[PDB]
Design a protein around this ligand. Structure first.
Ligand code: CLA
Ligand code: CLA
Ligand code: CLA
Ligand code: CLA
Ligand code: CLA
Ligand code: CLA
Ligand code: CLA
Ligand SMILES: CCCCCCCCCCCCCCCCCC(=O)OC[C@H](CO[C@@H]1O[C@H](CO)[C@H](O)[C@H](O)[C@H]1O)OC(=O)CCCCCCCCCCCCCCCCC
Ligand SMILES: CC1=C(C#C/C(C)=C/C=C/C(C)=C/C=C/C=C(C)/C=C/C=C(C)/C=C/[C@@]23O[C@]2(C)C[C@@H](O)CC3(C)C)C(C)(C)C[C@H](O)C1
Ligand SMILES: CC1=C(/C=C/C(C)=C/C=C/C(C)=C/C=C/C=C(C)/C=C/C=C(C)/C=C/C2=C(C)CCCC2(C)C)C(C)(C)CCC1
Ligand SMILES: CC1=C(C/C=C(\C)CCC[C@H](C)CCC[C@H](C)CCCC(C)C)C(=O)c2ccccc2C1=O
Ligand code: SF4
Lengths: 79, 216, 659, 86, 131, 119, 79
């Protein structure tokens, strides 16, 4: 009764072991970093989440990670 | 039938009525270095003092409460404590970096300890624990060093092989190949070649019988 | 795999040479070829080590001067070029205007001198030739890789018409995995013919070099005198040549036993094993072959350790007070390591190689042993308990009586059996003489008896631990399903009462401590009897003599090496005495404190790093996220620290006391 | 990740499921035993390897086995908190 | 119809027995079934019915039990004579030390004693086999 | 004597300070490669390619099958059906082919899930 | 030397030092040339060990592979 379908082997269950498909957000969160934001009137904030165009660290190790699963092994249903 | 809650990203949900009244500590998730989160949402009839898995204590709001953590372990421990307090409506979600919400703990809406229809055994083995095949028997195969993952048919086949190979006196020794008769792959029927191989094997067996009967 | 922690390096380094565990090592063909190439590289390393020793003797050392006056002179190992040394004044290792030098305690000088080296030019030619041999070894590795690749290509390109072409899958590594031909050629050429060749070398080079007057090589160079020539205090070279001739002839004869190149001659090892008492085993098992080779090498290393000291084979080697002790201790330690290695690889064979029959079937030696492993272990435990109880109790009785001041009250059991064997050997040797052997017969007393029983205790307990590990590797009453798990795994959880040190690798870890203890006992016995034969004979019956007359008394020169008064040539030994003490103590940390505490501490340190202002914006911690060492990793690291400290703190002591 | 396997000796007492710290296990209908249920391990990716299921298993030898795989360690099986591999 | 655990065990037993016979047969090829592995070399079965075959004697399988017995006895006598003469009743150590050569007869003779031993085990094997 | 120390002045540093530092830096650089330790770290493209090459080779194309070795699978199956027919309990609907398929199939979706990284 | 050994001081054992170094610069250079050859060969061997066997070679490599007659005889003989 699990909606998840195993991509590698349809007969077996999905590696996730879940029964409800994921819910996508209205707009996916964009990459950001916590930095200061000088207030233009002498003030300054400490942890201000500000957009970041690309990966904070462009190493192949960092960028290869998609978060779909432990090894990104979940099918398209993971997203 | 199960509906997945919105569960906005913690960075977006700075202040919410759902969050319980808790002291705060340095045991919370590191926001600078991690992005994956786990949200636990439950409903409480009264404000019961409870201990946060991350440091200090907390007070749950009468109504809907939502908490954020870094690990499913923390979420599950909090859920166990809530169950001890008789709060059975709690749900756990995994929040990816991009906001995708995956409903995790009551995977099908029924607690795992309670049996539910539509559940099929996973990682189940049809024999006693010692029924697994010998690790040395399946070497240089799919299960080179994982005898606890061999299929039941493979286990049965390997067991039968080890029983078969005890009877040393009558075991067919594989004929030594004639390396002279080698030709290029480019240079018939599969059944016909099998039949020819069988004629060759019978000839080998007859020759072996004659050779052994010569002096015996 | 980008997702990794700092445990990645340790996990890899723990199995870098575990070729069987390699990913994408599909078949025994790949395994055997990789092992063969590794063997070639190892031979290259050995030859480079020999070449380096020879080069440093030739260049940095004083071989030519030493051979003129070997008795009082001391060989030089190599120069010291260390900027950290004092520059204002001369160091203890210099002649106040000369390069610093180290004395050599390896006996390589005696080896070369009795081999027939007379000039540094010969040593240089040898350095050159052994470097060329290393080149040849590496090139042979490359050649064999290419040849095996060419056979796979051929098998791919050509196919037998019948469907049995897949049978060729088994014979691709025949050259590396064939046993009959390998045995024949090893025992005939690599051993017997090598001995005959060395006899030829002796007759041509060593005998004329030793003998001042020229004499043509003849049967007069082959003799059967015995004992040590008085002048060199070593075995007659003429006897060594006959010895090697005889052994070479015998083994050349034995090297025709098996069928190697043709099936018309020789017998089969499968057939011998099948018809012999030992039913049969996985002779193909590389781990089993390694275990047998290691056991043989261990026994031979022990034999050489004892016999080089007993019967001096090298010129003036006995005169070198330090070199004798160093050689004995070195080869004793190597032998102990090889023995425990054979045991560990037998355990690994059982874990992942042996094909056990069904339970009730008892046809092979291994199955028969597994039937009564419980009896074996119980009896070994009984013997160990008896030996320990009685040795320690007699020693403590003597200790208390000596402390109260009554030596007459000591229990002193005369070694009657050993004395009878020694007297029979002496009778045989005296008959031969009527028709000298130094250190082959020693006084032997009750102290010797007690020390021998202590060493027997050590051996029995080491074998107990190793046998228990081997025979419980596949399964155990506590962990019946131990075959599925790897050779070395952390634990099985705190359930079932707790399962620390439950793996066969954990039994090896435990037996390593014992090996070190029993080897320390052996070395202490040899060193004490060597330094003070009379004091050892009179006082070695109680442990306070060992603690006072051996350690505390002889520790003075080493600790006094460098002080506020000054330094001498043993200052380096004194600094390595303390460095190794520190290494041992560090190993205690990994052995005692286990992983959870250190993981939580690492978590706190990681929190601090991620909270630091500058460092957080550069280092996320995602890649190679720091972690505490795994349970097995820490066990191994603590064992390595313990072993390094224990082993390396002794040579400084022996050098200080015997120099 | 670790390998959590269940064998038919299982009697369906649910103690493993109740002892699971990260909810890796769940009871499923079965006919092999009298309880008519057997523990399963669908979410083995979350298994940390604490062997609390193994501790709580009653059977003479365990009907649930956790095989540790240190080479295939993931962040979920390592319980990583300060660092994120996702 | 429901397939009960007893039925599954019956299927397992029949499969085990039949397929074990098949693996023993020539239809199944495994690395353990090569020459030099478990199975006996073709045409040279060493052990049959739990009894050593003449092939265990190698090239002596064609020798009759009577002549094997005679050879073993003769070799034992000659080798024992040579050993005793060399060791006790005609020692050669003194002569060799003086400089003379050994009595070549004794050295070659003494090797016959172990040869005599193995020739008796071969004689027994041949006799026990009806030859 | 000792005039060869000019060699040492260049070699001892170059061998014990420069070479080790270069090796350590190179090792750190190598650790971050796609295939750092492909023969001991699971889920590497190089390891997957090597396995696929072995599979491509004719001799080893199906050497990883635990059941490999049956010269005549059809005859083996026919004999197994005959045996099951003789040993069949009365009113048994279990067929040899169906039973073999069921036993071959299992539910272990978490075995070597790292294969996805490589492919 | 400043000896620190009791036996050395008692018996007057000495570490004689030559007047001239044993080997000359040319000899050391020749030994270093041989060592360099060893190093090049060793780097090649390490690369070969790292990369292992290449079964794909039959697809593109020149030639058709070859087995020595002695190797064929060994294969026919068996183990
Ligand atoms: C600050 C302390 C210090 C330092 C830094 C050194 C440094 C040195 N001493 Mg030492 N020395 C010291 C104190 C110190 N000493 C003291 C207090 C004494 C007593 C007075 C001495 C007495 C002494 C003597 C008598 C000699 C030295 C020598 C040397 C040199 C060794 C060169 C060599 O071959 O290295 C090579 C190092 C090794 C083979 C050991 C490596 C061990 C580690 C654990 C690595 C193991 C390998 C592993 C696989 C890792 C590889 C990683 C790599 C690839 C990156 C070096 C310049 C020797 C010399 O002059 O050589 C020319 C020498 O003969 N020293
Ligand atoms: C870690 C391992 C180890 C180490 C470091 C040592 C260290 C030592 N051993 Mg050795 N040894 C070991 C293991 C080890 N051993 C083992 C396991 C055994 C048992 C088999 C022995 C048995 C042994 C003996 C019996 C002796 C030593 C000796 C020595 C000393 C070396 C002398 C030397 O190199 O002369 C320099 C070498 C030469 C001048 C010539 C070497 C000749 C060989 C045959 C070279 C190789 C041949 C080459 C490949 C041929 C080319 C091919 C062609 C023929 C076709 C030194 C204390 C000797 C000793 O104590 O001396 C005082 C000694 O007599 N060892
Ligand atoms: C990649 C790493 C690596 C490295 C560096 C080595 C290095 C070595 N391996 Mg190899 N090996 C490896 C991986 C590796 N191995 C792997 C993964 C396996 C699979 C398990 C093996 C399996 C293996 C086996 C089976 C053997 C080796 C051996 C050797 C040696 C090669 C030849 C040599 O120079 O011997 C130099 C050795 C000598 C000069 C000493 C010769 C004397 C021998 C060792 C003892 C003979 C005793 C005899 C049988 C009985 C005497 C009886 C008497 C007492 C009456 C060397 C120590 C051989 C060896 O010597 O093992 C101890 C060996 O037999 N290896
Ligand atoms: C001085 C320290 C010390 C002592 C006294 C012992 C004593 C013992 N160890 Mg050992 N052991 C030690 C250190 C020591 N160990 C260390 C540091 C380790 C590493 C963890 C081990 C690891 C170890 C293992 C793994 C095993 C032993 C065994 C034994 C027994 C050997 C037989 C014996 O002597 O019985 C006589 C008893 C005594 C001398 C103790 C004194 C009794 C009274 C006071 C007299 C005994 C209980 C073996 C065993 O249990 O054999 C049955 C065994 O399997 N030990
Ligand atoms: C001599 C033995 C020994 C040593 C060296 C240490 C060392 C340490 N222990 Mg202790 N420990 C020991 C035994 C030892 N332990 C034992 C037997 C146990 C079991 C009971 C423990 C149990 C234990 C615990 C439970 C804890 C410690 C802690 C510590 C750390 C203290 C803080 C620190 O690092 O400052 C001092 C560090 C040193 C003195 C190390 C040597 C530094 C030298 C002098 C300088 C290095 C020079 C140079 C850079 C070297 C380069 C070499 C390279 C080129 C080859 C330190 C790593 C605590 C910790 O980690 O706190 C942060 C901690 O929590 N230990
Ligand atoms: C250890 C004891 C032993 C045993 C029980 C056997 C048993 C057997 N061997 Mg033999 N064999 C041995 C040792 C042994 N061998 C040795 C040491 C060698 C190496 C020389 C051989 C080499 C060998 C070969 C090449 C062959 C056999 C074969 C046989 C079979 C026939 C024997 C026969 O006819 O003997 C009766 C014959 C004799 C007594 C004459 C032997 C004369 C030669 C010169 C050898 C004697 C050497 C001597 C013992 C050592 C001299 C030492 C020196 C100091 C003088 C039989 C299975 C044959 C077979 O059928 O194999 C399948 C075969 O082809 N063996
Ligand atoms: C394995 C043998 C060996 C060993 C242990 C040593 C040890 C030493 N040599 Mg070297 N040396 C060797 C062979 C060896 N040598 C050979 C064959 C030659 C002739 C070319 C030389 C020529 C030489 C000179 C001219 C000098 C030294 C010196 C030294 C010292 C510092 C290191 C150095 O400068 O190296 C420099 C030497 C080389 C780079 C040549 C190659 C050395 C060997 C073959 C490397 C073997 C590597 C090993 C197998 C694996 C390493 C793995 C690594 C990744 C951890 C030290 C005592 C110095 C000295 O005496 O200081 C007081 C010095 O001036 N050596
Ligand atoms: C100097 C003279 C005196 C000292 C002599 C040396 C010390 C004594 C030797 C140590 C005693 C044990 C020896 C046995 C070795 C094999 C054991 C083993 O593999 O198990 C070690 C085990 C293997 O690892 C385990 O394997 C299991 C499978 O069997 C499982 O997978 C486990 O999860 C896994 O942890 O544990 C480790 O991984 C240990 C971590 C190793 C970390 C080392 C990294 C740093 C290396 C620096 C030093 C250079 C190395 C090269 C040396 C150069 C020499 C020319
Ligand atoms: C290229 C070309 C052509 C050409 C050409 C010609 C004429 C080329 C000529 C090339 C020439 C004439 C090249 C000499 C080299 C000498 C060397 C390398 C000497 C090294 C010597 C060494 C390395 C010795 C070293 C040492 O041993 C010494 C001596 C002392 C010892 O202590 C140790 C050391 C190690 C120090 C053709 C044929 C005309 C047409 C074609 O179409 C293209
Ligand atoms: C003199 C001269 C010259 C040259 C010089 C040089 C440049 C040198 C160099 C030198 C060097 C720079 C050397 C080095 C060496 C090294 C070595 C010799 C090593 C080796 C190694 C080995 C043998 C081993 C290895 C291994 C390992 C360790 C691991 C694994 C893998 C292997 C096995 C491979 C010239 C020509 C210009 C001119 C003339 C003169
Ligand atoms: C001290 C200690 C630690 C902590 C020690 C750790 C994590 C290792 C400390 C690191 C040392 C100092 C080496 C690091 C040196 C450089 C960072 C090397 C980097 C080079 C790489 C490319 C290999 C444990 O984790 C542990 C676990 C289980 C039992 C005992 C212990 C234990 O005693
Ligand atoms: S974690 Fe440590 S203490 Fe706990 S059972 Fe495992 S080995 Fe024993």
């Amino acid at each position: 009764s699990s909606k998840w379908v195993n991509p590698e082997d349809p007969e077996m269950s999905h590696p996730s072991g879940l029964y409800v498909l994921p819910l996508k957000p209205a707009k996916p969160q964009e990459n950001y970093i916590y930095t200061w934001k000088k207030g233009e009137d002498g003030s300054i904030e400490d942890y201000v989440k500000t957009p970041f165009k690309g990966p904070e660290r462009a190493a192949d190790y960092y960028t290869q990670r998609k978060g779909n699963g432990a090894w990104d092994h979940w099918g398209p249903q993971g997203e | 039938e199960i509906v997945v809650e919105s569960i906005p990203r913690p960075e977006d949900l700075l202040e919410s009525p759902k969050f319980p009244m808790f002291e705060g500590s340095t045991g919370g998730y590191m926001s600078r270095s991690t992005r994956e989160r786990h949200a636990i949402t439950w409903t409480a009839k009264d404000q019961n003092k409870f201990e946060m898995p991350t440091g200090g204590f907390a007070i749950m709001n009468k109504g809907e409460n939502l908490c954020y953590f870094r690990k499913k372990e923390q979420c599950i421990s909090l859920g166990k404590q809530l169950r001890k307090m008789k709060i059975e409506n709690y749900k756990i979600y995994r929040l990816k970096k991009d906001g995708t919400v995956i409903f995790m703990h009551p995977a099908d809406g029924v607690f795992p300890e309670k049996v539910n229809k539509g559940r099929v055994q996973v990682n189940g083995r049809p024999f006693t624990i010692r029924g697994n095949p010998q690790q040395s028997e399946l070497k240089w195969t799919k299960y080179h060093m994982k005898s606890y993952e061999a299929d039941p048919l493979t286990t049965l086949f390997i067991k039968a092989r080890v029983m078969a190979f005890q009877d040393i006196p009558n075991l067919f020794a594989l004929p030594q190949p004639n390396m002279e008769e080698m030709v290029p792959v480019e240079e018939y029927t599969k059944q016909e070649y099998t039949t020819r191989l069988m004629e060759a094997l019978k000839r080998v067996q007859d020759d072996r019988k004659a050779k052994e009967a010569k002096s015996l | 795999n980008g997702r990794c922690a700092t445990s990645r390096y340790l996990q890899v380094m723990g199995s870098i040479h575990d070729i069987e565990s390699y990913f994408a090592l599909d078949n025994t063909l790949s395994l055997n070829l990789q092992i063969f190439t590794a063997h070639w590289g190892h031979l290259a390393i050995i030859l480079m080590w020999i070449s380096g020793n020879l080069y440093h003797i030739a260049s940095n050392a004083n071989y030519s001067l030493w051979i003129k006056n070997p008795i009082p002179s001391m060989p030089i190992a190599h120069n010291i070029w260390d900027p950290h040394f004092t520059s204002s004044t001369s160091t203890p290792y210099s002649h106040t205007t000369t390069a610093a030098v180290l004395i050599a305690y390896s006996g390589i000088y005696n080896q070369l001198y009795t081999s027939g080296f007379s000039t540094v030019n010969q040593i240089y030619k040898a350095t050159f030739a052994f470097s060329c041999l290393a080149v040849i070894s590496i090139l042979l590795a490359k050649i064999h890789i290419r040849t095996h690749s060419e056979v796979l290509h051929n098998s791919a390109t050509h196919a037998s018409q019948i469907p049995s072409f897949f049978q060729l899958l088994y014979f691709l590594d025949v050259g590396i995995s064939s046993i009959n031909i390998r045995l024949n050629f090893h025992t005939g050429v690599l051993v017997g013919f090598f001995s005959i060749a060395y006899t030829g070398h002796l007759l041509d080079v060593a005998i004329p070099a030793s003998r001042a007057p020229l004499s043509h090589t003849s049967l007069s160079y082959l003799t059967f005198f015995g004992g040590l020539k008085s002048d060199t205090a070593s075995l007659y070279l003429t006897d060594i040549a006959h010895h090697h001739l005889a052994i070479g002839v015998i083994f050349v004869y034995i090297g025709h036993l098996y069928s190697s190149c043709s099936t018309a001659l020789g017998t089969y090892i499968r057939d011998m094993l099948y018809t012999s008492a030992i039913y049969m085993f996985q002779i193909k098992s590389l781990h089993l072959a390694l275990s047998l080779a290691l056991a043989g090498c261990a026994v031979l290393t022990s034999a050489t350790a004892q016999h080089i000291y007993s019967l001096t084979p090298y010129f003036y080697l006995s005169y070198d007070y330090v070199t004798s002790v160093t050689l004995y201790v070195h080869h004793s330690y190597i032998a102990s390591f090889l023995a425990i290695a054979s045991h560990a690889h037998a355990a690994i064979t059982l874990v992942r190689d042996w094909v056990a029959p069904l339970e009730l079937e008892s046809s092979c030696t291994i199955a028969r042993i597994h039937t009564h492993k419980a009896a074996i272990i119980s009896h070994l435990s009984w013997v160990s308990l008896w030996l320990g109880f009685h040795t320690l109790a007699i020693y403590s009785h003597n200790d208390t009586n000596m402390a109260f001041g009554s030596p007459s009250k000591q229990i002193l059991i005369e070694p009657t059996n050993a004395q009878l064997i020694q007297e029979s050997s002496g009778k045989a040797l005296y008959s031969f003489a009527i028709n000298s052997f130094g250190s082959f017969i020693y006084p032997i007393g009750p102290g010797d008896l007690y020390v021998h029983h202590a060493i027997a205790l050590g051996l029995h307990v080491t074998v107990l631990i190793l046998l228990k590990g081997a025979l419980e590797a596949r399964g155990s009453k506590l962990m019946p399903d131990k075959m599925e798990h790897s050779f070395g795994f952390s634990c099985d959880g705190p359930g079932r009462g707790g399962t620390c040190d439950i793996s066969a690798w954990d039994c090896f870890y435990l037996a390593m401590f014992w090996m070190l203890n029993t080897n320390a006992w052996i070395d202490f016995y040899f060193h004490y009897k060597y330094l003070a034969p009379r004091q050892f004979s009179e006082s070695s019956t109680y442990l306070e003599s060992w603690f006072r007359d051996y350690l505390w008394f002889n520790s003075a020169p080493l600790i006094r090496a460098y002080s506020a008064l000054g330094t001498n040539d043993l200052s380096v030994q004194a600094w390595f005495f303390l460095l190794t003490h520190l290494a041992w103590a560090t190993g205690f940390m990994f052995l005692i404190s286990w992983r959870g505490y250190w993981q939580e501490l690492i978590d706190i340190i990681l929190y601090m790093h991620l909270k630091t202002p500058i460092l957080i914006d550069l280092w996320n911690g995602g890649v190679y996220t720091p972690l505490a060492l795994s349970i097995v990793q820490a066990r191994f690291i603590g064992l390595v620290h313990f072993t390094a400290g224990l082993i390396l703190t002794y040579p400084p002591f022996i050098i200080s006391t015997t120099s | 990740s670790h390998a959590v396997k269940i064998y038919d000796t299982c009697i369906g007492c649910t103690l493993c499921v109740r002892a699971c710290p990260t909810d890796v296990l769940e009871m499923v209908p079965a006919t092999v035993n009298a309880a008519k249920q057997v523990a399963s391990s669908p979410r083995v990716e979350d298994c940390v390897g604490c062997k609390r299921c193994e501790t709580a298993c009653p059977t003479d030898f365990l009907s649930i086995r956790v095989y540790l795989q240190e080479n295939e360690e993931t962040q979920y099986s390592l319980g990583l908190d300060l660092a994120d591999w996702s | 119809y429901k397939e009960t655990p007893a039925d599954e065990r019956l299927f397992e037993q029949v499969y085990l027995q039949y397929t074990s016979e098949y693996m023993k047969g020539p239809m199944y090829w495994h690395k353990d079934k090569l020459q030099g592995s478990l199975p006996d070399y073709p045409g040279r079965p060493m052990i049959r019915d739990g009894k050593y075959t003449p092939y265990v004697l190698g090239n002596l399988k064609s020798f009759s039990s009577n002549e094997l017995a005679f050879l073993s006895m003769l070799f034992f006598g000659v080798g024992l004579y040579g050993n005793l003469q060399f060791n006790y009743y005609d020692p050669q150590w003194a002569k060799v030390d003086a400089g003379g050569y050994f009595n070549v007869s004794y050295i070659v003779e003494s090797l016959l004693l172990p040869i005599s031993f193995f020739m008796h085990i071969a004689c027994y094997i041949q006799k026990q086999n009806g030859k | 004597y000792g005039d060869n120390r000019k060699w040492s002045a260049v070699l001892v540093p170059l061998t014990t300070l420069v070479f080790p530092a270069v090796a350590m830096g190179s090792f750190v650089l190598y650790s971050f490669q796609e295939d750092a330790f492909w023969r001991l770290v699971p889920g590497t493209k190089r390891a997957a390619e090597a396995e696929k090459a072995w599979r491509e080779h004719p001799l080893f194309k199906d050497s990883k099958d635990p059941m490999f070795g049956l010269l005549n699978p059809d005859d083996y199956e026919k004999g197994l059906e005959e045996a099951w027919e003789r040993a069949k309990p009365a009113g048994s609907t279990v067929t040899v082919k169906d039973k073999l398929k069921q036993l071959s199939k299992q539910d272990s979706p978490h075995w070597e899930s790292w294969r996805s990284l490589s492919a | 030397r400043v000896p620190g050994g009791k036996r050395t001081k008692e018996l007057g054992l000495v570490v004689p030092i030559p007047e001239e170094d044993g080997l000359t610069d040319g000899q050391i250079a020749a030994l270093f040339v041989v060592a360099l050859v060893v190093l090049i060969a060793a780097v090649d061997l390490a690369r070969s060990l790292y990369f292992g066997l290449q079964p794909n070679k039959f697809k593109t490599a020149k030639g058709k592979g070859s087995i020595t007659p002695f190797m064929k005889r060994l294969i026919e003989n068996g183990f």
